[PDB]
């Protein structure tokens, strides 16, 4: 449980679009043909690889993420409350230091939350 309230939290994020997304295009893909489930498979794939030791969230959040933060390894840096979407932000505070959350469904699509701090 959360035994402390931090005003500064650092979390990295990964995002994969889906067919029902508002923007069916990205800075890497021309059209998002993959739906929720197809994107979810990728999400779980990334997570499994990281937990196994195949790769680290750095490469996934950079070369396998649509998040603009991908250029910075997918990290958002140290942010505060009222800075990110509630499902993500509230989850970040709920997570512990060094915790990688699973598939979190948000506006854009499925998000992976890695709370480093």
């Amino acid at each position: 449980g959360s035994h402390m309230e931090p005003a500064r939290v650092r979390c990295s994020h990964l995002l994969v679009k889906h067919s029902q997304s508002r923007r069916p295009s990205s800075w890497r893909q021309e059209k998002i043909t993959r739906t929720k489930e197809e994107a979810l498979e990728l999400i779980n794939g990334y997570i499994q690889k990281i937990k196994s030791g195949e790769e680290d969230f750095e490469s996934l959040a950079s070369q396998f993420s649509d998040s603009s933060s991908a250029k910075a390894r997918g990290d958002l840096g140290a942010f505060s409350r009222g800075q990110m979407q509630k499902p993500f932000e509230d989850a970040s505070f709920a997570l512990r230091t060094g915790e990688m959350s699973g598939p979190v469904f948000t506006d854009s699509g499925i998000h992976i939350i890695l709370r480093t701090e």
Side-chain angles (χ1 to χ4, degrees):
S2 307
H3 295 102
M4 59 175 294
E5 181 190 82
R8 298 173 178 120
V9 59
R10 177 188 171 221
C11 302
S12 308
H13 69 142
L14 186 153
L15 179 278
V16 179
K17 304 188 190 303
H18 53 104
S19 305
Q20 306 304 90
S21 296
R22 292 181 177 177
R23 194 62 52 195
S25 51
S26 62
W27 51 278
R28 49 170 296 155
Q29 198 72 331
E30 303 306 298
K31 61 176 182 295
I32 307 299
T33 317
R34 66 182 61 125
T35 190
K36 168 178 172 287
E37 298 304 271
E38 295 173 280
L40 186 60
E41 297 184 281
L42 299 179
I43 297 297
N44 283 274
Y46 305 149
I47 299 176
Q48 291 183 89
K49 295 193 70 182
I50 302 172
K51 300 193 300 176
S52 303
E54 302 290 86
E55 291 192 75
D56 182 81
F57 193 68
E58 292 184 302
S59 54
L60 286 307
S62 303
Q63 299 178 149
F64 296 82
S65 187
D66 168 77
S67 301
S68 311
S69 314
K71 299 179 179 181
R73 287 177 288 166
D75 187 49
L76 290 170
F79 57 93
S80 196
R81 51 176 173 153
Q83 297 299 330
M84 178 55 65
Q85 301 301 90
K86 188 65 178 183
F88 185 105
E89 184 180 285
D90 185 66
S92 303
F93 289 103
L95 300 177
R96 56 180 175 140
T97 301
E99 186 67 272
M100 186 173 60
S101 180
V104 180
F105 302 103
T106 332
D107 304 78
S108 42
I110 311 174
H111 297 215
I112 305 179
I113 314 177
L114 175 66
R115 179 179 177 170
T116 40
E117 299 292 300

